[model samples]
Target: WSYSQTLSANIQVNALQRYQEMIGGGCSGAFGWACQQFPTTGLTPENQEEVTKILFDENIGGLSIVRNDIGSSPGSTILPTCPATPAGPFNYQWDGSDSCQFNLTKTALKYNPELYVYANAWSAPGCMKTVGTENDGGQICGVRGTNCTYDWRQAYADYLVQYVKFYQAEGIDISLLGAWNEPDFNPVTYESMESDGFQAKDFLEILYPTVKKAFPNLDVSCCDATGARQERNILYEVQQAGGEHFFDVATWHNYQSSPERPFNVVGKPNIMTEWADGSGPWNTTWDVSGQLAEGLQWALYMHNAFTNSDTSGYNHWWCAGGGADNVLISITGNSYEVSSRLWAFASYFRFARPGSVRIGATSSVENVYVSAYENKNGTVSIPVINAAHFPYEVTIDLQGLKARKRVSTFLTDNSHNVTLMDQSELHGSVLKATVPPRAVQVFWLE
Candidate 1:
């Protein structure tokens, strides 16, 4: 069974020309209630065991990072709020799991201990916002100009730090902490807050010092903008306002805008924190034909984010979805489907792992998206995606490193569920691989 048409790409991979470290590829547990939305609800104990393995298992779904919302207590609908007002003394609450998120996160740790947990705040408490409520778009009251009686800036910082510390008590290490989600937009429905770069800088003036003093391992990332261009704009604003030094790591979302190019912030490690298509109605399909639900398109999206976008971390909107094209592993009630989307990411997360550095992997042909990463285990994972309709016979030049008969290729397409390809030839410094049309493949050195 030979195709009459075959495209060829010569990808030159240089292990020395390394880029940023891929912290992880994962999902967010924000609006997903304790019932049926995220990783798994403790409802069906049977579902919890399987779903945990599906998302957190390194050899399975291979998600290495888990982002949890630091519930703003939008009228007690999110997480438990400390005090109803700033005038009163802060009283902390304990649940081991905030809305079952901590329990789910801890469950994920059982499968992979080194999971990267990111705690992000969507809005400050009602007492901390100028709108006098956590819901609807409001600005933090004490961020220089918003104005408040008690100056909730320090209080909000304390709130975030306590969330991290509490997770520590539960034995989950939160390595990444984001101050706000989409600081540039004001939403009228759910928990949200608006802050410009300078205002965010003001909040960070208190937030950063307080957190680092409490827990030093956690890295504070800035400005989870709703769009890539907005993140770029906010970064410029922060630099101009003389507060760029506050956050050394960059993060953003791909909802309102596209991450078309490398977010190459000078010295910052970039993270495209969220990616999802339009919302409404639930879907469970590998490819929505010409639409965004197609897993092949997502393969290209993830590939671009790493190879061209200079993004070190990539996270989907949800781990187990209840939305359209937003989830990796789909779940509705007791039924669940592992969409091809998960396999596309599994090719990267399972092989690249964390601490993997992106090396130069440029193709001679267009649409033959290729990216190489040097794993910490003395191996390289060359993730390739053939976006064209023509299947490709790829010849990779592993510049200086030659294979020693320990190389393998894994393919995940519309039909193949992450199968080990039948053919691969590694001769001297050249490795020949196969990537089907609209499919994802990983060529790795053993």
Candidate 2:
């Protein structure tokens, strides 16, 4: 069943031919206990410090972006931004503990100077919705709803702008603002809403122009579709309605299904803002026999996104809290466990850095995924995976670049947590590795 190692295929890393620039990779959470959970178990100040470090630290898990879950359950009397009604003077409130998201993000920002943070509401405030409830999917009251006395579009836009100002007042510059998360889906168990492309375009027509006047430096993103196919459809509708110029980046989730080809929108960067193996339970193992949440599978998933769909920034469901089958870390009763999923992205965020360009990388052999990155700092990083049934001595041929390298080698498999291999294989422009059948390997050429 086993034979001597052979060359399955030669992965060619073409540095000259570049593609999309990375927005960096990271995870989400640090909300209601993305406020409550960490406090429930309560880490010692020391434990809390290490937890954040494990996530944000560049040398360890080098996560450069964080998606903070916010504006979910704010109420009228409970420090709500708009206490009176939709057409009234707004009352902005500070998230003293950030619902637990801000303090964590603040700590992360401390260590990660290049960190980018963005906010999205699961649903708009109940007062702004036609359903008059945050849960069970609804449309905003004024833009397309008849519930309010006047068109509440500008009022809602101002409310979101106020949210940004409140954060700015606290010293966090929320870069890109999004109107909805999974606008196509109607979920009853959580704060969600259903908005089609045209209606969404109608709202953005107001939101975009309004935001431009208030915050010219900050950008706007749109329509987190449950799937990529829907994403294209939504953006197309916006285009037909002359609303395409209203936003910057286009966002989508990969849950309804993964993308088959790039969502090429002239100049917009498409981001798979949320993805995970929603099979259930908090799985921490790197790769179990048949489970989808394994760390190796995540590496493969990101590979698919970058190579096949050209997704720039990928955010998994949660960094710590969440009950789905995937969380980079699991925190429970004063104890926390970091999963291989973190290590999977560690290989990504660490070397395939922000502002890095995706270059040409081809794996002629089936089941092998290869990706190369050209960083702004005059370094080239390549990540290769062997999903074959057997291990092989894979040769990595770097093209259009100089000879010699830093030989920074790291391997992550079933037993390794991105462990630095004391040894590496590099013979001028032709580097090689005796790679495992199911593994994620990364090397940087400085």
Candidate 3:
């Protein structure tokens, strides 16, 4: 037996592990906006450089995918700095040209070298809004604003093309483009451009096509729905609404639900283009695991995603910020901090490459969610999570496959709390283990 318990028929592997891939990265204007309050000393070039190294270092080997926002939030917040004052009197200027936004992005790509970059605009130019300003809500709605209603569609399209052109000039290419940010949620006031099914359809059916005609070679996707229901609606709408010709991916945020939510979208593969794990004001539920178990937990989610190949990829919200709950990395002056989530993210990213496909696995127990993948090197990675409070045994009848020579397990037990067992062995097909309540584990066999 590979586990601590004796062999018994009490265990039964539940369902086939779902497969998904993550095409990740988020717009960083939000993080930058949050960090700006720390004073220019905290926002210096040296600080940015350190943050870039923390997020993009080759040894970090994870972070295979990343993307950034076009600019900061247009709305006001608790921070006096926010509700970003536009232009002369107090214009927030971190994104365009050689500003902090562009500088950091340039460095992050350097470590990945071939990383795929994507851009999405959160809000449009304030001058175009009906409110005649960006801060708070007046009659502003993003799409209904001056430029958006007038030449805005074409102009905005041109803006995107220009942004891409600028990056290309610097030797970087933003291969993907999303038309707008979360349209489903009300942007706090009438000034916010809110949407329901109608607005989304109009944009995709009319506006999107116009934008595409302008740049036939560029890829475009719309409606980054806030969550599940919206994601489903967008997915189905684009597929049947003559949108297949316009959008390339059906994307959504996954902050509230368990891994199961994305699986629902994956089953509708014809509709979903790609999906990621989160977007938010940042929730701590994702950060529950201690430092050691962090990787295992993240591996568990990655494993869940890999099983559902259709989902594409997973990314946490705010990769860098001082918020105790949000960012994966944080910067303090010239120094930087990597949250437990980053370590969790590295567990799988460090080994699983972009093209890796998930394979089928049958275990001897239920409640212990498990999945397996056959890597290009002929090695097998089995990631499992024992959700219950009791110990359980898992037996894999590898008897059908060629004889295996080496096996290892990375166990995270509740009792141990931290320090996931990086590598534990499995004797033949039967592995005896004790999984504490609420812990994750990964197994590798050669």
Candidate 4:
């Protein structure tokens, strides 16, 4: 009573060849006061090399966009810097050159040619605010005082303008600029911050236009709040204040949540700039299989970003680590320390180039994460992940054709992760395989 649909390797995947969205990599401690943490010792130089080789090397020809920060989230904050150096308790510094950010930018450019770089600042300089310092719960919006002139509104904008000019002087062309990061995440603690809605509105209304006047060609957008609710708010507020035109894209962030909803916010080319599911707060040295499961989820996430046809691109929060946040690998680790999560990211980043076409395919089954990409030469790759704790059988009824000249499987399971399953011998239009629990598998059909 089983009917298997035929599949042709020669059939070009239609859905994959659509518009090209962005895929980005990011990190903290790269600019402002946080730059002090970049590890001088490079153990997995090869790992670092691999990332640049895949992302920057112009030969591969897939990636087009890369996102880098201007400075610390609150570049103005005096929070005790991570991996604290010999420098005493940290505070504000006028070092506006952001020499470190420029250096990283150059290094990243080696792997990607003519990439789109978006610059966003988490906070303003300490001197520009009404409080005279950045920290705890303080408004960047100017409070009528002698030290505060024209409110913190235009002052903050002027600071950003100068920052961009500095980067420009160094030859880093920032394709996109954001006004703020999570204005709603107001913090009452010592090392954190928050910018209220009024501050945000004032910034957009006043500073946005002023910045445009200063940098005519640079694109302006709202970095808005992170997550679904915040995204919805930005959509309404930006349009309400007539700041829509000033905003070029919707930037969002999420941690430990499904990417399905954000992806569904279709019809606009939005950017899921920050998201991660690997480690944080409690878990460290995360479960390898769980990581693979998350990787598979990434495939679904990517598909959602594509099929929802609305999401323009995605970026993993921090490539390598500090900030007590998710890092592909801890930047300070001495050993060759590689996390399964990082390995999972490599599985896709290795083969899936930035602009590779994401083709259309549908699955009748549930809990089976699937994503398909097509090459112009009649070849296709199907990456599937089974995040469930138990294994399941998934049967794909290939829409057209009868024979596949080549069918190879690339998977990450318990003992088989980062290896070729060597099942290429079974070549044909119809294929069958039992997915492993907490695993990621990719099939290349040529």
Candidate 5:
């Protein structure tokens, strides 16, 4: 376990010329029902607090963003009755169904008051869709082919704002709102809305102003597509159709495609809003704890998102329920288990802050990827992924950063749970550490 006995690996870091994307935050909050169920279903306050800290506490994940569903998505362990869908001004009524989720949001703020909430809708109410059912393929009412509508487009926009206003009433101000989730995908049991880039633009034309009029500070993003390729097309078509200015951020999901190159939309920031590997059980599986390969896969996926796509924020899907254990913490009664998946996220979230700027960093070893970020507080975070089967002796060089104190590191692999490494053998500005085989290590430049 000594650095002297390991193979040589070099990491060059440049503190100057920092590329500022400003990491907003990260989270694994579920769509809607899971939010309500997580608190009530066997998650004792003590266990809940423990889970919350792992996500929002500065010494842990330090996540600042929460992704919430706008309701209408199916699947919940408790099968909590769906949040009341208001169709008109007369029928508009705020139901307290989301009290649990709202309470959770308050709880998170108690830890990180600056946390941002991003609200996304899976579809408009079934009444506003052409299919007249929340489930399956259907475009919003006003889209050319979907005729015989009752001004459903405007109604949908109003419904969205009403939801925001409802949250605001609860003292939880939503920071970002998206029009749809997986706009191109059609599901048989859940709520979903189909929209092409142009159709999305049309929806935004109505939604942007309606939301702005009510919540002046709320920002709008669009088309949470299933992959980067679809996301790129959505943004391009929206821009081509002269609707680029309608949305503030271009958010996307990464379940279908791995994170690759940056999905740049001339003026919009890219946010990978939702992602999770769906290969195993759709809900819970105790096997995730020992699944080191899946753990590394998620780690590498995030490394690519931060380095290759320059994504500002990343949110994992499903914070808790529905038969799926592919979440950060698997809740079973008053006790819970933190998965390797959470550890993969902690590799970046713990050290990298909201306003952190990405800095130049590289590794000399193959199969080893390095990404560095300089936090707003001047602390530099370098996350290294050693995908190779053998250990590597890493030499991290901090350019322009003269170290007087020891470097701090957190590691996650088959054998560790973001364990802090020994910092006794320091070499001034140069850090030499032994990275485990197929592990992700994050070093904090103090």
Candidate 6:
């Protein structure tokens, strides 16, 4: 649906009630972008520092989670390298590949000490798969060798433990270890592993115990399917197989599905772990004006995650990459440019910190989307998105909250970047303001 015409609306917020699903935090995917050399060598120290600050600074995106890849074999490679059992004691050789990512994590920690870092493997080591390579589709060799006498489950679990141990030794802690990415889809083109619910249950039966023994503090997540539908089925099978406790988080990606429907595990939090859509043709020309419109699209997706799915956390696919749609911040030479998407995210992340609860809100206009949150600091935040081409004069009734006399406003549109406008007056339990057309505004009330 396109909002081609002008629309008006009245936003109403009820602060007395809240949703059960709490906002975990804003997050970003950090993969090959962290590499020392891709086409170009490495990001200059100044650029690296600046990028981290823009992403992790509390005044900026304030992203609280970083998802990194746990290496498997790259696509098209016949031979699999380290962590393949035959490569034991494993010695956690992949740490070399993770050096830059770990350093980035460290930098993020210095900024938001509460930052969470999770690790997930696209596929198990080549030697552990039935196909004996990471490229094509394959199930993990649950029971391997002649006469099925040897069970490689323990060995596979040990490989993950070694990865966790290596990171720990380097002073980086992994908060969660995921079983696999898109376990339902086993593609031949890239690194992928297949695991049906039963298969995932079997793997977790062995994997969780081994991980617990090694690091009792680390949580285990599973069935990182490509979408909610597949995740729901996989999670149901996993639960039926008595593997519910094996997962602390039920994660899904947003490649082929909408975030409108909520996906949940019986007792685990749900997170949209990866999403990067090419909604338009890739543009080489730097157009801040173009990105402003694009940012509204991303911001709307995030709103759906919170309102429809009650998603605990949301993570975009690669923080920095070569694709126009993939990276939120594009790096060029010694400088980098921020996307309108970044400010769109900051419109929420900078205020809705972890542990914030989603509160009730309603809008009179169909094109005006609004959601409120009660932060742990006792402040209420409401992010309003005016999708129509016309402006809106919004009268916000806070229900019961009436402490702060002024409502702090941060707006992002074709011309604004979380730019603070003159504080508006909060009369009794109500605050009044005008939201620009096709713009995002976040209002803060103490």
Best model number under lDDT: 1
Q: How accurate is candidate 5 locally (lDDT)?
A: 0.72
After superposition, the stretches of candidate 4 with alpha carbons farther than 4 Å from their true spots are 1-20, 25-37, 40-67, 72-99, 114-116, 137-155, 188-202, 205-218, 256-259, 262-267, 276-310, 322-325, 374-381, 389-408, 416-418, 421-434
lDDT of 6: 0.73
What TM-score, over all chains together, does every model reach?
Answer: 0.93, 0.93, 0.69, 0.70, 0.87, 0.88
lDDT of each: 0.77, 0.76, 0.49, 0.53, 0.72, 0.73
TM-score of 5: 0.87
Q: What value does the lDDT take at residue 302 in candidate 4?
A: 56
Regions more than 4 Å wrong, model 3: 1-54, 57-61, 72-99, 127-151, 189-192, 205-218, 255-310, 334-336, 374-380, 389-393, 397-438
> Native-vs-model 2 lDDT?
0.76
Model 5 — which ten-residue stretch has the worst lDDT?
75-84
RMSD of each: 2.6, 2.4, 7.2, 7.6, 4.2, 3.9
> Please, what are the lDDT tens digits per residue for candidate 4 over residues 310-390?
455566665444543354444454442333554445445445555455565555455566766654455566777665666
Candidate 6: TM-score?
0.88
* Sequence-dependent TM-score of model 4: 0.70
Tens-digit per-residue lDDT, 141-205, candidate 6:
86322122245677778777777777788787888898588988877877788878878888898
After superposition, candidate 5 runs with Cα above 4 Å error: 1-6, 24-41, 73-90, 281-293, 402-406, 424-428
Ten contiguous residues with the weakest lDDT in model 4: 1-10
The predicted structure with the larger TM-score, 4 or 5, is 5
Q: Which digits, one per residue and each the tens of the lDDT, describe model 2 over residues 6-109?
A: 56677898888888989877777733546433464565666677777888888778887778755656442122555555557665566456666777778778
- Please give, for residues 154-273, the per-residue lDDT of candidate 3 as tens digits: 444444555566666677767566655565665564223444444455455554555556556556655566665666676665555445555665666554223444422322221122
Question: Residue 142 of model 5: what lDDT?
Answer: 84
